[PDB]
Design a protein around this nucleic acid. Structure first.
Ligand SMILES: [Zn+2]
Ligand SMILES: [Zn+2]
Lengths: 886, 886
RNA sequence: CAUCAGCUACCUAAAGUUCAGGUAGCUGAUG
């Protein structure tokens, strides 16, 4: 929930930085430089925190009543800070607007695209130092990322032993190089005493730094200056810090013995180095390997001072001089990141990522949300019809609000808050999302009772969560503003608030490409969640997946003639078979009636002839007819076939691959004979008529066809594992050896979409009917159609009682509209009514929502759940009756 | 080549920058700022040119004879320039060394790795400007690359209808934002006259720049300052440049009428803008669109001055303020890149590039050049044996040269210059490349004659080209020095080097990991060359490819039982078959003797039975013998089988797929029956005995087995296409329609390695024999073994005459060593002799070098070239005969 | 909180394109 803010209530995280001087002239004439730096730091830290936490607004109070942003500007130091924070351009992330006595900085979230640097977060200073010749350089964010990746790569592989000290070698004199400085510094370090004003024969280098003591508080100044050099040396190659050496004259100076105590100085140096932040990519976690030594300075055997030399060894990993200058938002406060958190965020590579959704979002957007100059479109279709029939005035009111927009899309929802995974409000009738070119995105929240006090907060929160989901889940990397607007139906004429929310001009959708990008992000967001729009776009998404998978499978039409295709539960092989026949006709240039489809059930037969131009018959018709004109045969639900009516396999083999007795004919034809098999649903195991599993070659196992919900897929996976644990004696274990849970789980994570699957038990008939009627009413309120719901009973003798109870419950809930409730059998797929039939009659058919009603069958039958889940795409509701024992 | 350099003859590109002052105090005290800036610019341009051209050395003469790098360092301004040029650290690229009166800067080539930004070249300044609030920012190299990619991506996707009007913008009453300043600037631009010192109601912004006219030369100052603002505006969003407006006081100042001519000022502004460099990603290539306006200022109806306002519209792709501040080395000179060349190198994505070679380079290095502490090893073994037998003291002299190097690898070559694709020198006996830990890489060049004056130049050029190849082709991104040394065999009075070559200590192989990386780079370089070492590495590389491809193919053992495998020419199906038998034994857990391999030729059967533990017989033996214990059958060269001895296909099918009779046992066994087919190598094409092509299912086409030279694969591709143009009349062309030329070309590029394929025509027996003898002698000098060479005749009757001619030729040419040259038949492939037989007897067998001796068989047969190429791995020499008398 | 030495912009005198300076910015040292 966003923090309450009644004046300028933006649907963003708002950071109040207090009273700030603004304007180029006003900033320049500031006399208190400390206050100037304080104001600059507050604003820049807030910007960095907002850049790292999804964007937001910075609100600053303007002290000058005569200040005008048009005539005065921002300020040179503020702009310099912005350019330091955003070297790629602050225009892409910052916008400025003056609202009366406030100045607002609109911060867009830091989200790089593919064609840019792979920086995950923003930093002022990384505070990782690297030694470049004779300078300790505070690395930029990109430089720090390079260093982190190099250290991680080096430490991923181990370095045991490391006996590469190699005693010592011979030095060289005729040639001077940087290694000579390190050798000379090491010779200096092994000394124990120095003569006063002793000349040093070496200068600073990559491994040598020269420092001098101060004529003021000495230990605190060393504590400020040391971390930079220690970090720089440890990070690059190691080196020496020579405190007490004059840079220019190269003479030993040292600190006077009265002004410092060498033991205390040693302890302070050790303390400051020990507390330096560190990150390790290795497991041993070595500490910073350093050794400090005090060298007494003597003037004619008289103690005069000390020279402190610190040896810093190369570090295996990164060393921080302090915590990085990077900020995030935590509990509505700008919080500094620690070194450990900063490295973790900087090296993140997560940006659970759906490959297929982002691959097909463009096609889904071009199909479902086309950006055209063809008047404003109201989506989704079914929900809009229900809302407009429920309220006559709603449609005209929306057109009045939308005007004067000519091109755009308005996407309705029963609850947009619930659509994005947050709380549904009962007092909210619906939410409409207007998306148009050269317009801000507007979220209209229609209320039932205008006197409800939570409308403003609900709309603001919903707009905020939608934008956050679009940026994070949807991957939207643009400037978009969602304006929450509270609307009621009580007055046909509705007018906005006296303080309309305003955003910079850059926060509108500039063109059609930006509108298309936002709509593609919305496709991703909706597919990631649970709603009616998710279910409908999920059906379209599954169609695209079926098309690509069917293309891959048809590539085997030129490699095989006879093929046994083993399919896991829930792969949707009927759709695969339909597209395969399409490819057969295309490739073999045959007549559509030359391809034959053989299935076991008649409802599936009716469905297939309705969806294909090829000849489809049941196995009974296949055995009772003549098919001399058939060249190719595709078989489905072959596991339910029977040998009682003859050898269907021999007949199919003879048709597709006819042998010649006595040859004579030179036009022998070999045809396609593909059998789609599902070993996991082989029930009532009599003589199947199939050849033995040893002779079922060549074979193909289909693993990546699961087109159901994640919850439904997990139920089927659990059932498959349990079945494999205790396989029935009537099915061959060798066919079950081809199914692996790991491959099945990988396919589920690749394809399946979030859905609904719940179970309720110990319910009487009236309770089960009541649950189904209430849930169906709830689904119809959200925009679901009756053709999306199927109620399936385990046994066919329960149909009559269940139908009677369902009519009673549904008419009881429909006390306003006395319309007769129509149920249709499994053959009514083209119908727009709720399908009510048995699980065996619905074989090969699937619906978005399935209610499964069964008696108590604990350990009596272990197949019923698998069959129920195979007919459901998004919603599965398992209901179990009460065991009537008396 | 390399420019001659008597002093400091480094095998690098040396840039001489003349006399330069060095040292911190010397640079700081320098009074002539022009001379100081000039020296800094010269050095920094040389460094950038070397970073972009494979590295090199910079030589600067030191004017101060008392200067010492140990005690004076380099200088403040020089180090600052390095930090701008190399923001990621100059420690990884720059090394310094004083050598007498010269200071040397060693520049390592700029080569980004996986853990770095994808910057291809180094630049001081992109000179691409971007408007950040009220500043025109000269973008860095990384920022410029990001901007270039953004514009390239935007021009990749079409922006149609060019609706850049952006409706109309009006000023809001109470909201002030950055768009308001642009609107106010447009209103000011539309004005025609001004008032003297009249105030402005807007300030600078992203679209507004205020500039003042100068009280000096006006046109030069305008022409100097304008390109930055024009580039910045055209690159960000467009804007207005208001010349004549005071930024501090915000009134119109203007320039006096007597000081400039407005027509002249407009013309110079036009000329300046159209002279700006510009790069385009689009196709229209529009020019930079700008509009200049002169606003007269009138003070009481008196013409006082003029104000120039320039309006710039958002450019399509890119505008440069001037040529990019980046350099390369072109014709031994530091040359500034132009805008077009700079964008090309910046956007270059070339890193042909062998994917498989870089994948297998690590395994190849660990197998052929192991890095352990096992004393210095000599490679390659065959060439080393030849060299040490011909020169008795060579091994001892080499051993004393390496001393005291304990661990390392010496890689000999008859010509290392030839190995890297350059000119071989007959005056050079051999080159030995020493690679060792804690040591520089040394290239020893042994000369037969001490008095040859070209020895030093040859050694230096070879070292330079080898390092360049290692960096470019090999992908080596470390600091490595290849020190060229001249070595003399006969002269025992070994004169030491007058001027030893010195490199910074960072140019040694620091540890074992760097040694392995350098060796992997050398493996990549060798695999991209034509040499003996490349041929041996290619053999091992092809073995790894066979392992990978056989594993992929064995994945089908669980899916098929009978499989018709079609193999392209040059697929090496015998090696695939051998590994498949291993997998059959592994998977079905059967005895090795229960797997039967069937081929046609006796030589292939012999080769297979030494290569595998499974049973292997020919087709005649298979038909005659009894194999009731055989469970799986793999058949090779099935296209050559003969059906006059019976039905081998039916016999194989009954063994692998027996038919049950009398029922009783339900444990029928189904065995593997894999047939390897080569449709293009069917000679004497009678009834094969295979089933008709309509019944050869399931099938698999293999194209990813091409394991020969690029040239040999290209020859086979030509012959395959000519086969497809005029198909044979004894079989249906349906089988030959499964071989696509594009797939074969893709496979050849993916796997094949560079080699030799030469054709010679119109030669009598004596010329052919002499040519083969001279070629064999040349190969034997390079380290080729006699087991690498096979001489194959088209006609079996020519074997004796060719044998006599070849024996005479090699006895005539072997005047230095009377080795007994023995020719082995096609049954002695595993022997150490040269194979001399016919093409028919060598079927299924390969050798690295093949000599094909054929008569004038043009327009008589058409399989000869394909068959000869199928037997050659790296070298193919096709020789043709004339009409000789009896 | 001051001061100085180094890195682009802006400005004035000087000179046939040098030059003297001056200003606010960026970051090293001292106080
Ligand atoms: Zn570590
Ligand atoms: Zn363009």
């Amino acid at each position: 929930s966003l923090k309450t803010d009644t004046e300028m209530p933006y649907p963003e995280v708002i950071v109040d930085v207090g009273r700030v001087i603004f304007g180029e002239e006003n900033r320049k004439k500031m006399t208190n430089s400390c206050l100037k730096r304080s104001e600059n730091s507050r604003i820049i830290r807030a910007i960095c925190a907002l850049l790292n936490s999804g964007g937001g607004v910075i609100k600053a109070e303007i002290d000058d009543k005569t200040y005008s942003y048009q005539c005065h500007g921002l300020g040179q130091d503020l702009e310099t800070s912005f350019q330091k924070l955003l070297p790629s351009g602050s225009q892409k992330y910052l916008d400025y607007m003056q609202q009366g006595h406030n100045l607002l900085i609109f911060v867009k979230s830091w989200s790089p695209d593919v064609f840019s640097l792979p920086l995950r977060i923003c930093s002022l200073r990384s505070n990782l130092y690297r030694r470049d010749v004779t300078s300790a350089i505070n690395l930029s964010a990109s430089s720090a990322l390079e260093l982190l990746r190099e250290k991680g790569f080096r430490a991923q592989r181990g370095r045991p032993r490391v006996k590469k000290l190699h005693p010592q070698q011979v030095l060289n004199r005729c040639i001077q190089e940087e290694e000579d400085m390190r050798i000379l510094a090491s010779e200096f370090f092994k000394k124990d005493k120095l003569m006063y004003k002793e000349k040093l024969n070496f200068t600073e280098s990559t491994h040598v730094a020269f420092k001098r003591f101060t004529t003021k508080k000495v230990i605190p100044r060393i504590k400020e200056m040391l971390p930079h050099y220690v970090s720089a040396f440890a990070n690059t190659q190691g080196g020496y810090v020579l405190i007490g050496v004059d840079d220019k004259s190269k003479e030993v100076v040292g600190c006077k013995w009265e002004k410092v105590n060498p033991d205390l100085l040693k302890k302070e140096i050790e303390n400051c180095i020990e507390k330096l932040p560190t990150f390790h990519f290795c497991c041993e976690k070595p500490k910073v390997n350093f050794t400090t030594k005090i060298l007494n300075v003597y003037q004619k055997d008289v103690l005069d001072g000390y020279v402190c030399v610190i040896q810093v060894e190369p570090f295996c990993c990164v060393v921080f001089a302090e915590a990085p200058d990077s900020w995030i938002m935590k509990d509505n406060s700008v919080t500094r990141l620690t070194a450990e958190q900063w490295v973790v965020m900087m090296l993140d590579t997560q940006s659970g990522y759906p490959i297929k959704v982002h691959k097909f979002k463009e096609a889904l957007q071009r199909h479902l949300f086309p950006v055209t100059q063809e008047e404003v479109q109201f989506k989704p279709e079914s929900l809009c019809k229900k809302l407009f029939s429920d309220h006559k005035e709603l449609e005209g009111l929306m057109k009045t609000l939308i005007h004067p927009c000519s091109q755009g899309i308005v996407i309705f929802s029963r609850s947009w808050a619930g659509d994005v995974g947050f709380r549904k409000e009962q007092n909210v009738l619906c939410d409409a999302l207007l998306i148009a070119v050269n317009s801000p995105v507007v979220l209209y929240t229609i209320l039932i009772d205008p006197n409800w006090p939570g409308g403003l907060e609900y709309a603001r929160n919903t707009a905020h969560q939608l934008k956050q989901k679009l940026q994070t889940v949807g991957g939207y990397t643009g400037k978009v503003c969602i304006i929450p607007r509270l609307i009621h139906l009580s007055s046909t004429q509705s007018r906005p608030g006296e303080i309309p929310l305003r955003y910079p001009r850059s926060y509108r959708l500039a063109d059609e490409e930006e509108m298309e990008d936002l709509l593609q992000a919305l496709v991703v967001v909706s597919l990631s969640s649970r709603s009616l729009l998710s279910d409908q776009m999920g059906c379209e998404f599954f169609n695209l997946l079926i098309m690509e998978q069917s293309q891959l499978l048809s590539e085997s039409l030129q490699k095989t003639r006879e093929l046994f295709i083993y399919c896991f539960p829930g792969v949707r092989k009927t759709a695969l078979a339909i597209k395969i026949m399409e490819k057969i006709k295309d490739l073999f240039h045959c007549k559509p009636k030359e391809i034959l489809y053989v299935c076991e059930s008649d409802s599936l037969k009716d469905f297939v002839t309705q969806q294909t131009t090829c000849q489809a018959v049941t196995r009974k018709t296949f055995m009772q007819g003549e098919f001399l004109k058939i060249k190719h045969i595709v078989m489905d639900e072959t596991e339910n076939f029977c040998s009682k009516y003859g050898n269907w396999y021999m007949k199919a083999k003879n048709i597709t691959h006819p042998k010649a007795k006595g040859t004579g004919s030179e036009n022998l034809h070999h045809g396609i004979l593909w059998l789609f098999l599902d070993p996991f649903q082989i029930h009532h195991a009599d003589v199947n008529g199939l050849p033995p599993p040893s002779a079922q070659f060549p074979r193909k196992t289909i693993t990546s066809g699961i087109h159901c919900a994640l919850e439904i897929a997990k139920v089927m996976k659990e059932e498959m594992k349990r079945i494999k644990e205790n396989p029935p004696s009537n099915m061959s274990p060798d066919t079950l050896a081809l199914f692996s849970e790991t491959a099945y789980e990988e396919a589920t994570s690749a394809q399946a979409l979030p859905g609904v699957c719940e179970t309720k038990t110990n319910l009487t008939t009236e309770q089960i009917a009541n649950y189904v009627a209430r849930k169906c009413h709830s689904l119809f309120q959200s925009g679901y159609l009756p053709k999306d719901i199927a109620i399936l009973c385990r046994r066919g003798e329960d149909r009559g009682r269940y139908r009677l109870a369902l009519l009673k419950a549904m008419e009881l809930i429909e006390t306003h509209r006395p319309s007769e409730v129509v149920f249709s059998p499994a053959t009514g797929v083209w119908g727009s009514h709720i399908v009510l039939d048995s699980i065996q009659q619905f074989s090969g058919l699937e619906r978005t929502v399935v209610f499964g009603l069964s008696p108590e069958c604990d350990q009596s039958e272990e197949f019923h759940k698998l069959c129920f889940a195979s007919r459901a795409i998004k919603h599965l509701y398992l209901l179990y009756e009460k065991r009537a024992a008396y």
